[PDB]
Every structure is written in structure tokens, then in C-alpha cells.
Design an enzyme around this catalytic site. Structure first.
Site, PDB file in Angstrom:
ATOM      1  N   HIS B   7      -3.733  56.504  31.293  1.00 21.22           N
ATOM      2  CA  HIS B   7      -4.586  55.855  32.413  1.00 21.22           C
ATOM      3  C   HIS B   7      -5.157  57.128  32.871  1.00 21.22           C
ATOM      4  O   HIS B   7      -4.987  58.294  32.771  1.00 21.22           O
ATOM      5  CB  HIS B   7      -3.815  55.248  33.516  1.00 21.22           C
ATOM      6  CG  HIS B   7      -2.717  55.910  34.096  1.00 21.22           C
ATOM      7  ND1 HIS B   7      -1.335  56.374  33.686  1.00 21.22           N
ATOM      8  CD2 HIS B   7      -2.733  56.178  35.409  1.00 21.22           C
ATOM      9  CE1 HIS B   7      -0.615  56.588  34.586  1.00 21.22           C
ATOM     10  NE2 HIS B   7      -1.418  56.909  35.680  1.00 21.22           N
ATOM     11  N   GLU B  41      -8.875  47.494  33.951  1.00 25.63           N
ATOM     12  CA  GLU B  41      -8.670  47.506  32.212  1.00 25.63           C
ATOM     13  C   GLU B  41      -9.855  47.121  31.618  1.00 25.63           C
ATOM     14  O   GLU B  41     -10.573  46.268  31.869  1.00 25.63           O
ATOM     15  CB  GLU B  41      -7.620  46.429  31.759  1.00 25.63           C
ATOM     16  CG  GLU B  41      -7.385  46.590  30.349  1.00 25.63           C
ATOM     17  CD  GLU B  41      -6.088  45.963  29.836  1.00 25.63           C
ATOM     18  OE1 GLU B  41      -6.003  44.696  29.979  1.00 25.63           O
ATOM     19  OE2 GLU B  41      -5.014  46.487  29.169  1.00 25.63           O
ATOM     20  N   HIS B  64     -16.334  64.717  33.363  1.00 24.03           N
ATOM     21  CA  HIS B  64     -16.825  63.426  33.215  1.00 24.03           C
ATOM     22  C   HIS B  64     -16.198  62.507  32.133  1.00 24.03           C
ATOM     23  O   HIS B  64     -15.408  63.036  31.499  1.00 24.03           O
ATOM     24  CB  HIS B  64     -18.403  63.620  32.787  1.00 24.03           C
ATOM     25  CG  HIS B  64     -18.725  63.887  31.450  1.00 24.03           C
ATOM     26  ND1 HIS B  64     -18.664  65.189  31.234  1.00 24.03           N
ATOM     27  CD2 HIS B  64     -19.126  63.150  30.501  1.00 24.03           C
ATOM     28  CE1 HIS B  64     -18.995  65.430  29.960  1.00 24.03           C
ATOM     29  NE2 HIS B  64     -19.499  64.458  29.557  1.00 24.03           N
ATOM     30  N   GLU B 110     -20.237  57.926  31.709  1.00 23.01           N
ATOM     31  CA  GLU B 110     -21.125  58.269  30.629  1.00 23.01           C
ATOM     32  C   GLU B 110     -20.791  56.982  29.602  1.00 23.01           C
ATOM     33  O   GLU B 110     -19.623  56.609  29.377  1.00 23.01           O
ATOM     34  CB  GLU B 110     -20.955  59.217  29.887  1.00 23.01           C
ATOM     35  CG  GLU B 110     -21.385  59.161  28.340  1.00 23.01           C
ATOM     36  CD  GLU B 110     -21.456  60.633  27.599  1.00 23.01           C
ATOM     37  OE1 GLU B 110     -20.775  61.414  28.140  1.00 23.01           O
ATOM     38  OE2 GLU B 110     -22.000  60.565  26.253  1.00 23.01           O
TER      39      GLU B 110
HETATM   40 MN   LIG Z   1     -19.902  63.352  27.331  1.00 26.80          MN
HETATM   41 MN   LIG Z   2      -0.849  57.984  37.521  1.00 26.24          MN
END
Ligand SMILES: [Mn+2]
Ligand SMILES: [Mn+2]
Lengths: 134, 134
Positions: B7, B41, B64, B110
Site C-alpha cells: 500500500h 482501491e 511521484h 502520473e
Molecule cells: Mn514517472
Molecule cells: Mn502503513
């Protein structure tokens, strides 16, 4: 429409050290490197390292990056990182084993046993303050 | 030992705007929320939002988060984010179509067409300065 996570990129001030840490400590495969960065791979995860020299490190916040680990490997991975004297930034208090450590630029990282499925289930039994499910 | 990305957790100053952006613009499913956060999710990606009001953004570095999208969807997706006035932080210069954008707290995001293999392939034919393969 987005299909998932394509890659994760982190800014790193010391490229050699960041490669040695994610490759050797954390076990990503180094695919290629160059003067301004590296590409590494952990299972299906694509990690970019972007060399950025005046990089001071992240804001003191909870933004962070958690990798998976199976239950039976967790103990030895945590011991291994302590044996390498990797600094911890937080102690565990949620469902499933978690080890919280810093990388060479102080990016905040986490080894976690569990997934979103297991978190919800547990949260269902013992919900956080003002929690609501879908 | 590690298996992949478990995560991603993003500190956010305004929890409902962040949820609105990830869910309504980006197509994440909201699975739960509570006083100090939310879980969302995207495919197999588990995004946590950590409610943090004294948050002033990430610092000014190349850190990023790239999300996957099909070639055929990439145009409609950029068009829509631009139509909603999202802010771009970068012009796409590397291999594959990419659209670089910020979330309400200024996390760099992105949308990218391709993967690590498409990139290594391009890199073999057009290598960066100092480029070295494994
Ligand atoms: Mn990239
Ligand atoms: Mn965590």
C-alpha cells in the site's frame, strides 16, 4: 481509466547508497542504472530512483510506502534490518505485523503482513472512531 | 522476502476533497473512511489517505506516483483532468505517453502508458548518460 500502480519514483541524493539499500537490504532486482538514476523491480513493482542532489528528504508527515511480506518471513526481515541498524520511525499498532523503517533519504517505509482485505475485516470487528464502510 | 507494494499512504489536509479527487476523477473505489482517514482501491492497489491538516505539501523533489492506463484511454483521461483544471507539473519527455499531475495536496502523480520492459527496450536503443544494464 487507470488500471493500478505503474511505478513508484523516489528522489535520492546519494544514488549508490539508495541502490545498495533497495537492492541488498530490501532485495529489489537492479535492472539498469545511469548517472541520474536507477530502475529496480520487486515482483511486479517497478521502482525508479531519481538522483537529486540538493534533495533534503521528505516533510515530517505520515506519507509512506509499504511492501508486502508473508507471515513466516516477517520476523527475520525485521531482525535483519535491526542488525543493519536501520532506523525505525514508528511503532506498530494496527492489524497485521508491520515494521516501519527509513531509507537513506528518510523516505518512510514499511514491511507489512496483511492486505486491504484483512484490514477491512478486522476494522469491521473493531472499527476506528467514526468509521464507515462502503 | 518482500513481495511487492502492499500500500501507498498519502497525507492529505482535506480528507473529503482528496476522496472526491481519487474517487471521482481518478476512478479509485472508496472502501472505507473514518475520522483520520480513508482506504481506497484501484485494481490491486491499496491507497490509504491519512488526514493531516497541518500538512503543507511534499517538498519540491521528483518523488511521484505513476498509475497505469491503456494507450487507447490515455487521450480521454488527460483531456478530462485538464477540463477539471488539474495542475501539470511536467512535460512528457521519456518513452511512452505520460501526463504529469498534482492531487489537491500537491502530491505528483502520473498516468503512464508502458511498463519497465517497454522502457528498458527504448533505453537499449537510446541509452541515458552512463547507462549500464544488469
Ligand atoms: Mn514517472
Ligand atoms: Mn502503513
Amino acid at each position: 481509466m487507470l488500471t493500478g500502480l505503474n511505478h513508484l519514483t523516489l528522489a535520492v541524493a546519494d544514488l549508490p547508497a539508495s541502490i545498495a539499500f533497495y537492492r541488498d537490504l530490501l532485495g529489489f532486482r537492479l535492472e539498469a542504472r545511469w548517472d541520474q538514476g536507477a530502475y529496480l523491480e520487486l515482483g511486479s513493482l517497478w521502482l525508479c530512483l531519481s538522483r537529486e542532489p540538493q534533495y533534503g528528504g521528505p516533510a515530517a508527515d505520515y506519507t509512506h510506502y509499504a511492501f508486502g511480506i508473508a507471515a513466516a518471513d516477517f520476523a527475520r526481515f525485521a531482525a535483519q534490518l535491526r542488525a543493519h541498524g536501520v532506523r525505525e520511525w514508528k511503532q506498530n499498532r494496527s492489524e497485521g505485523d508491520s515494521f516501519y523503517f527509513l531509507d537513506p533519504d528518510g523516505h518512510r517505509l514499511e514491511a507489512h503482513v496483511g492486505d486491504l482485505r484483512s484490514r477491512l475485516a478486522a476494522c469491521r470487528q473493531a472499527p476506528y472512531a467514526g468509521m464507515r464502510f462502503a
